[PDB]
Design a protein around this ligand. Sequence first.
Ligand SMILES: CN(C)C(=O)[C@@H]([C@H]1CC[C@H](c2cccc3ncnn32)CC1)[C@H](N)C(=O)N1CC[C@H](F)C1
Ligand SMILES: CN(C)C(=O)[C@@H]([C@H]1CC[C@H](c2cccc3ncnn32)CC1)[C@H](N)C(=O)N1CC[C@H](F)C1
Ligand SMILES: *[C@@H]1O[C@H](CO)[C@@H](O[C@@H]2O[C@H](CO)[C@@H](O)[C@H](O)[C@H]2NC(C)=O)[C@H](O)[C@H]1NC(C)=O
Ligand SMILES: *[C@@H]1O[C@H](CO)[C@@H](O[C@@H]2O[C@H](CO)[C@@H](O)[C@H](O)[C@H]2NC(C)=O)[C@H](O)[C@H]1NC(C)=O
Ligand SMILES: *[C@@H]1O[C@H](CO)[C@@H](O[C@@H]2O[C@H](CO)[C@@H](O)[C@H](O)[C@H]2NC(C)=O)[C@H](O)[C@H]1NC(C)=O
Ligand SMILES: *[C@@H]1O[C@H](CO)[C@@H](O[C@@H]2O[C@H](CO)[C@@H](O)[C@H](O)[C@H]2NC(C)=O)[C@H](O)[C@H]1NC(C)=O
Ligand SMILES: *[C@@H]1O[C@H](CO)[C@@H](O[C@@H]2O[C@H](CO)[C@@H](O)[C@H](O)[C@H]2NC(C)=O)[C@H](O)[C@H]1NC(C)=O
Ligand SMILES: *[C@@H]1O[C@H](CO)[C@@H](O[C@H]2O[C@H](CO)[C@@H](O)[C@H](O)[C@H]2NC(C)=O)[C@H](O)[C@H]1NC(C)=O
Ligand SMILES: *[C@@H]1O[C@H](CO)[C@@H](O[C@H]2O[C@H](CO)[C@@H](O)[C@H](O)[C@H]2NC(C)=O)[C@H](O)[C@H]1NC(C)=O
Ligand SMILES: *[C@H]1O[C@H](CO)[C@@H](O[C@@H]2O[C@H](CO)[C@@H](O)[C@H](O)[C@H]2NC(C)=O)[C@H](O)[C@H]1NC(C)=O
Ligand SMILES: *[C@H]1O[C@H](CO)[C@@H](O[C@@H]2O[C@H](CO)[C@@H](O)[C@H](O)[C@H]2NC(C)=O)[C@H](O)[C@H]1NC(C)=O
Ligand SMILES: *[C@@H]1O[C@H](CO)[C@@H](O)[C@H](O)[C@H]1NC(C)=O
Ligand SMILES: *[C@@H]1O[C@H](CO)[C@@H](O)[C@H](O)[C@H]1NC(C)=O
Ligand SMILES: *[C@@H]1O[C@H](CO)[C@@H](O)[C@H](O)[C@H]1NC(C)=O
Ligand SMILES: *[C@@H]1O[C@H](CO)[C@@H](O)[C@H](O)[C@H]1NC(C)=O
Ligand SMILES: *[C@@H]1O[C@H](CO)[C@@H](O)[C@H](O)[C@H]1NC(C)=O
Ligand SMILES: *[C@@H]1O[C@H](CO)[C@@H](O)[C@H](O)[C@H]1NC(C)=O
Ligand code: NA
Lengths: 728, 728
Amino acid sequence: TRKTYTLTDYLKNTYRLKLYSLRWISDHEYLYKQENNILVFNAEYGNSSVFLENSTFDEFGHSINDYSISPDGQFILLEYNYVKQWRHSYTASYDIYDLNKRQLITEERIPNNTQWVTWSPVGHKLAYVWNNDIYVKIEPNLPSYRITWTGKEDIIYNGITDWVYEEEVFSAYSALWWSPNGTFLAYAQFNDTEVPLIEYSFYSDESLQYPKTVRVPYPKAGAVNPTVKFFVVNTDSLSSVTNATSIQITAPASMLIGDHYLCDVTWATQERISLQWLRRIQNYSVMDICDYDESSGRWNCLVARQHIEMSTTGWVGRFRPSEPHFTLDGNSFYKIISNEEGYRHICYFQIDKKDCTFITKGTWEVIGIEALTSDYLYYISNEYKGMPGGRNLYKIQLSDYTKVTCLSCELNPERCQYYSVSFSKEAKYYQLRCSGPGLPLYTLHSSVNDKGLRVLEDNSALDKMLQNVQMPSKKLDFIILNETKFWYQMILPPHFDKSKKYPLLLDVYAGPCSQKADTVFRLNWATYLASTENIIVASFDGRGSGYQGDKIMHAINRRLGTFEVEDQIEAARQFSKMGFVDNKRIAIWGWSYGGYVTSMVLGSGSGVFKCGIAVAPVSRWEYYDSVYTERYMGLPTPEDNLDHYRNSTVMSRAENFKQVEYLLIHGTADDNVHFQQSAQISKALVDVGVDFQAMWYTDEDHGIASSTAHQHIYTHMSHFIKQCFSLP
Amino acid sequence: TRKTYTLTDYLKNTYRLKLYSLRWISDHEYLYKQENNILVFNAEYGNSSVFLENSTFDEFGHSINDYSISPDGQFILLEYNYVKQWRHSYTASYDIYDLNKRQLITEERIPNNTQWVTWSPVGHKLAYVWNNDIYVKIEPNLPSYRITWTGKEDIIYNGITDWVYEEEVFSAYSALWWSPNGTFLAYAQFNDTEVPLIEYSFYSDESLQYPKTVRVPYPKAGAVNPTVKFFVVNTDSLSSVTNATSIQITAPASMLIGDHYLCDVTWATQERISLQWLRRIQNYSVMDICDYDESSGRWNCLVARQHIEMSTTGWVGRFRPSEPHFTLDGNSFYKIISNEEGYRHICYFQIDKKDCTFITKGTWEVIGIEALTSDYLYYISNEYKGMPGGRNLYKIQLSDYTKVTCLSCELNPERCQYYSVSFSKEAKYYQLRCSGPGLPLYTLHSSVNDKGLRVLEDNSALDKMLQNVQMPSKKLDFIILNETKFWYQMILPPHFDKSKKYPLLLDVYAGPCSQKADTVFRLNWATYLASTENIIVASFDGRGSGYQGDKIMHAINRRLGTFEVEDQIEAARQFSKMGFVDNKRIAIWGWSYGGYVTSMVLGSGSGVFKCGIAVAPVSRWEYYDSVYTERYMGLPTPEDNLDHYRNSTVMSRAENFKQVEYLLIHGTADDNVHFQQSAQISKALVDVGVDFQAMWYTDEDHGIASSTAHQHIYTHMSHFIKQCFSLP
Ligand SMILES: CN(C)C(=O)[C@@H]([C@H]1CC[C@H](c2cccc3ncnn32)CC1)[C@H](N)C(=O)N1CC[C@H](F)C1
Ligand SMILES: CN(C)C(=O)[C@@H]([C@H]1CC[C@H](c2cccc3ncnn32)CC1)[C@H](N)C(=O)N1CC[C@H](F)C1
Ligand SMILES: *[C@@H]1O[C@H](CO)[C@@H](O[C@@H]2O[C@H](CO)[C@@H](O)[C@H](O)[C@H]2NC(C)=O)[C@H](O)[C@H]1NC(C)=O
Ligand SMILES: *[C@@H]1O[C@H](CO)[C@@H](O[C@@H]2O[C@H](CO)[C@@H](O)[C@H](O)[C@H]2NC(C)=O)[C@H](O)[C@H]1NC(C)=O
Ligand SMILES: *[C@@H]1O[C@H](CO)[C@@H](O[C@@H]2O[C@H](CO)[C@@H](O)[C@H](O)[C@H]2NC(C)=O)[C@H](O)[C@H]1NC(C)=O
Ligand SMILES: *[C@@H]1O[C@H](CO)[C@@H](O[C@@H]2O[C@H](CO)[C@@H](O)[C@H](O)[C@H]2NC(C)=O)[C@H](O)[C@H]1NC(C)=O
Ligand SMILES: *[C@@H]1O[C@H](CO)[C@@H](O[C@@H]2O[C@H](CO)[C@@H](O)[C@H](O)[C@H]2NC(C)=O)[C@H](O)[C@H]1NC(C)=O
Ligand SMILES: *[C@@H]1O[C@H](CO)[C@@H](O[C@H]2O[C@H](CO)[C@@H](O)[C@H](O)[C@H]2NC(C)=O)[C@H](O)[C@H]1NC(C)=O
Ligand SMILES: *[C@@H]1O[C@H](CO)[C@@H](O[C@H]2O[C@H](CO)[C@@H](O)[C@H](O)[C@H]2NC(C)=O)[C@H](O)[C@H]1NC(C)=O
Ligand SMILES: *[C@H]1O[C@H](CO)[C@@H](O[C@@H]2O[C@H](CO)[C@@H](O)[C@H](O)[C@H]2NC(C)=O)[C@H](O)[C@H]1NC(C)=O
Ligand SMILES: *[C@H]1O[C@H](CO)[C@@H](O[C@@H]2O[C@H](CO)[C@@H](O)[C@H](O)[C@H]2NC(C)=O)[C@H](O)[C@H]1NC(C)=O
Ligand SMILES: *[C@@H]1O[C@H](CO)[C@@H](O)[C@H](O)[C@H]1NC(C)=O
Ligand SMILES: *[C@@H]1O[C@H](CO)[C@@H](O)[C@H](O)[C@H]1NC(C)=O
Ligand SMILES: *[C@@H]1O[C@H](CO)[C@@H](O)[C@H](O)[C@H]1NC(C)=O
Ligand SMILES: *[C@@H]1O[C@H](CO)[C@@H](O)[C@H](O)[C@H]1NC(C)=O
Ligand SMILES: *[C@@H]1O[C@H](CO)[C@@H](O)[C@H](O)[C@H]1NC(C)=O
Ligand SMILES: *[C@@H]1O[C@H](CO)[C@@H](O)[C@H](O)[C@H]1NC(C)=O
Ligand code: NA
């Protein structure tokens, strides 16, 4: 009898998914790491050579965390002493290796504790942030030019984001943008002077006698936000003037009237930069397009080139206003915008005309624009077979919009329905990344004729191994409610028999624009639960979910904690009605927004669920950050949406928890969803006399991803579920 | 057939013990609160009169927390707006009611947020502390004199103790000492300027958007300690035009050489005061005896009247050097000190003589000196029947030490073997409080011929109720380990049948000088476990325990976490050999020091225990405070006792928890044994891959005593124990 996929298999990663991560260095070559040495491949023929022998730095004295070759291939940036900070930020030491003369640079070295470093887009200039100020090096071995002098720990951030801009606005730590050929360096400056601090203890190693108090400028809903300023400096003048002037580009008067955010920066040409602002009440965005005035050294943004977006049935964009993709001459651009029917499609704009032209349409959505050439625009969408959970690459002829070719749909329709892509520098070649429903498949293609060049990685090794395992199957389908279809997926135990009653675990997330029913292949906790414990693990995308139009996505606008919670309960009822579910054993679990929904469901009094597990849950929206929360909830004030803020807390449903088995889990150093959120849930339960299970994870954050903690939480949750389902 | 003592009975206090808390106001009368009314009783005949009507303050407008009548009976201090701080500290608002003119005082009232207040010992002067400074009021309606002006929150403490002196040294917030007739007011001043701060989050009500960070000057082992100065001020010569002058009494030179503490202050006469200082290495104490010099208005402490105490086998005193008990003329005093055999007995000192004479002796110990007259010294000891866990009142004839009379031993030997006493002002009368093995019994007696005047409270009402309940019994016995007897107690289930095998729960504390095997009657969690769940709850006093001599108590000197832990395993090992114990179901639990020992035991790899519960445990001695920790462990430096500090942590034994079920509980706002201690335990268990159960209690301190948390924890622990013992 074949063995099953066990918890240890999952926690020990015995069945490794292979991938093929390459880095395009030009329009025909990419770097690939093999046997620890860096190889360089010729896309056209597939041949290669050793770019950097794995022995080059065997005596460097440190373990290199990552590397980075300058655009002109003359230098390599070595990163070490990596110290993670938030989701994207981290600190590290850096050294530069001169590839030509094959030597390490020992003078004018990048400072220790550098917060961020980036090569210019061309050549080998370097811009970095250290002690919250920006510095530029024209040559790797020469002295740096100081660009800002205002940097101040936890107060003024130049070139880097503060906590909330990192996590919610830019999804990146850097706040600097080189112009195309590297002449100009644009950057933002954040001022968190009056932003309140979240404070929590960090215990560290046992040797630390007194716990440390971590203090981070973090604006909770309705609190004082950081303010921001934008500047551009001409780096080509640095070696000619003692102190190059950073020219500020101010936000439009429509933004200065109140609190606002800088939500996008995209260079259009060597002398044209576009930037976008968003009002704190995120239903109005303004994009400015600014040209360099070579006679005044200033930047001017013609109001005739200003573009505005306004919210209709909800907020603006999926998670932020959409980014612009400029044609080469910088005189027009494309943005994904929801059309009159509520579906997000590509709209083509002339920089000085306010009305754009939709070039795609249909009851489906464009996921992203991937590349743009003089003749074609390439994008990913879920048009194929009307499956919102599928993803394919398409190419549209710019001179004839009726000519749309799907590049990935038919390659291997049964094995591949979820694609991501990576084009070479000028889109001459592209690597396709198939992630499901079958095993991941990586292929390389020629753009000139859209012909497959060769398979890069097919996971044949893993496929061989999995043949000796009773793997679970995955079903993706929909149910119709109120004449609209909602998708769901089920991870089904091996040899699934529909005449039997299986216990069911509802795996939920359900945040705004979320998607938990898709065609991606995953090896995770649910795999073990289905394969070894014979538990059906399901997920449902109800109101509030994404990629299916505004009608569904905006249903929870200003109403978090309502429909997305109820649809999850209704989903469970619908699943039991399918007849292969044991009504006495229906559980529910989620992490993050999933923890919030799980708790709301467990405290709803529905009686449908026997037990549930919430990991790092939000419990009351006033505890979460301003940018994310206010986008969907507005402000927590009586003149706006306070009533719903107070009506959507987990705490107010404490008494109903007497009807279920609850397990609450949270990392104590969670900088994102503060441990505070679960501390208030537990106290509310204690106050009404409800018994429950709990687990805190010392010094773990929102990912509870350290090796030991990861294994410990899934082991702990496994016992809770098996116990709840009376499983040996 | 009748009901058992249930968990709800314990949690809802269904069965309550009646008390008789009286307040002696002279040598002939005492105050007693009845029907919310304050009555005055004549000890001789038992007749009384109403002293204060319960309705007198029906329109006071504030809920009165407590009251304090001035010594002369003329005034009553009304305490309200009570806000708890640490174990003894709290702030409150006060009002003074004139009992002669039956009127509330409205002029010059005590400020709000007063930290401590106290009447002079005679008459009606007042001394209080506010904003860390001392104030004196000669009359309740007159303006107060400012005594100190250096008071500074968390830095300078005048008249009140800082965290460590409150908890570990004086067991009181107050640091003011009135002379016998109220003329002088002595006080200590603490300086915490360089004491590190423990920091932890306080979440508060749900409405608080950002958690608050509590910061408390708290010296952990080896850290910088607060410094102290001592002053005496004449309150009969205060001026409303000039600032009060405080006379300092510097510590002796042998103390000023290094870090030290003030550990006792005791007035001997109207013009003689004694002080005792202890070196930071708590093995050397120096008592000074100072006289007021009318000529220079200074206080002189003759070196000839200096008394030194040194420790050979361990530290000095049980928890601190013993207090002196001066005769009427203040020329000699009595103090409990360990004799040459290591047994604590009463020693008679001459103020200008180095050697003291022991007046009691034997293989037992004097627990405390209770009253002194020219003819007799009254004290409590565990001499009767050689039972270290029993307590009786004795009097010894000062003119003939061979004449010792037990005053409580034979009153009711079956019901009463544990007494406490309260003497009237000049020891003319005494109230005996019997607390076990039977129901509490309170009686009044006259000293002249030791007549038993009357029964004040006999709990006959509770006795009648308990007759309808299947109550457990208590067996107190001993086992012999290496020629030494060690005592234990077992709470046995109703109808105990020695032919059956019962599961056993070892209830442990085991800290230095602890005693968990005694004759006290208690209604607690163990009562329910034995009565309703038929679980035997045992406690054992092994090496390190108190009241049995230094040989036993000092066995763990400089070695906490060794013998006291080993002896608990040995006792369980023995209990498990008895015919009535189920060796497959032996558990262990403890709180505080008890949590540390339980964790050390569960991590010992002994295999004797199936499961255990640790509530707010200490996990590594460097996390606990200096005064308590260094007393038993010395300093955590390589030259002193660092290796043992490092070998005695719970964390180093994590791997051994693989074969036991462990439940770890801790309040997040524990200012005493910081949540840090458990946070480090949980991390070590996660690091070795050991699963366990946990529960944190939001905003609860070391007592986890709020009504809801109390009920929640015992409910959660009860489910854990039953589950471990397979009890329905
Ligand atoms: C799902 N996920 C990772 C998130 O929602 C987090 C981010 C992710 C990037 C988004 C985001 C921001 C800007 C561009 C962009 N393009 C795609 N996403 N995206 C903005 C939301 C969120 N901050 C969070 O941690 N919680 C935690 C509890 C509450 F549920 C929200
Ligand atoms: C039992 N108990 C309440 C204590 O031991 C606490 C105090 C009580 C007064 C004592 C004390 C001090 C001065 C005189 C005196 N006379 C009698 N006791 N006593 C000194 C010890 C201790 N600070 C503590 O909380 N922990 C917590 C974990 C570690 F176990 C010690
Ligand atoms: C991949 O192989 C090709 C062809 O073999 C290599 O092309 C070289 O190109 C240079 C520049 O035009 C010529 O001077 C050489 O003669 C070519 N070499 C050969 C063998 O034909 C190319 O360098 C290889 N690329 C890698 C990364 O190995
Ligand atoms: C960051 O913002 C703060 C405002 O919150 C600025 O601080 C003010 O600066 C002015 C001018 O120096 C002072 O008069 C105010 O008293 C300051 N207010 C506060 C609250 O500090 C600060 O200058 C800004 N810093 C930068 C670099 O822009
Ligand atoms: C480079 O120019 C900037 C911009 O003026 C200088 O920054 C100013 O410095 C002065 C004095 O230190 C401050 O009063 C101003 O508020 C600063 N303005 C800004 C925008 O920071 C900076 O000091 C100059 N650096 C050098 C070396 O001269
Ligand atoms: C990058 O683009 C910049 C901006 O267009 C170029 O700089 C200009 O170059 C022209 C000469 O063709 C000068 O007359 C202008 O004064 C320059 N403008 C500025 C702001 O410096 C620059 O030459 C380009 N760099 C490269 C390597 O092509
Ligand atoms: C409390 O005791 C003090 C000190 O013995 C008494 O004050 C002394 O009284 C005598 C006699 O009147 C004077 O000669 C001294 O000068 C006083 N000494 C001081 C320091 O004041 C005081 O009278 C007593 N108070 C009561 C109520 O008995
Ligand atoms: C207890 O009883 C005595 C009477 O035996 C009370 O009376 C004594 O004190 C009274 C006021 O203090 C006087 O009015 C009596 O004359 C006096 N009698 C004697 C014989 O001394 C006494 O007050 C009572 N005490 C209480 C608290 O009620
Ligand atoms: C309280 O103690 C501090 C020291 O812990 C006293 O200040 C001293 O220490 C300072 C360093 O913190 C030195 O810089 C000072 O010179 C030294 N003396 C003074 C007067 O500050 C402080 O005075 C003490 N306060 C009181 C009221 O005694
Ligand atoms: C301490 O605070 C209390 C409450 O503020 C003060 O008591 C009175 O409070 C009322 C309102 O509740 C005010 O109108 C009065 O002015 C306050 N004083 C009096 C005498 O009524 C109290 O005054 C404060 N303590 C002191 C010493 O002033
Ligand atoms: C009081 O206890 C201390 C600490 O144990 C003793 O001081 C020294 O302790 C070290 C161990 O840390 C020993 O090696 C020394 O022999 C001790 N003496 C000295 C002078 O350092 C101290 O001796 C004890 N005092 C008494 C009277 O027993
Ligand atoms: C590169 O280093 C690896 C060690 O990670 C070694 O196994 C391999 O043989 C080296 N590459 C070559 C081509 O030898
Ligand atoms: C970084 O710090 C290390 C350790 O202090 C030091 O030896 C090294 O020279 C530093 N590097 C730079 C570039 O300053
Ligand atoms: C802008 O947002 C506010 C608050 O959400 C709303 O009242 C207003 O109607 C919105 N305007 C538009 C054009 O959507
Ligand atoms: C005082 O109040 C209590 C209840 O608070 C009441 O029962 C009692 O009768 C009152 N005292 C008197 C003397 O009536
Ligand atoms: C008393 O001392 C304080 C603080 O030193 C001072 O401010 C005040 O003026 C003094 N009053 C007199 C009468 O000296
Ligand atoms: C005596 O018993 C103790 C425990 O009570 C043990 O540690 C010791 O080794 C035994 N022998 C001696 C000589 O103390
Ligand atoms: Na009697």
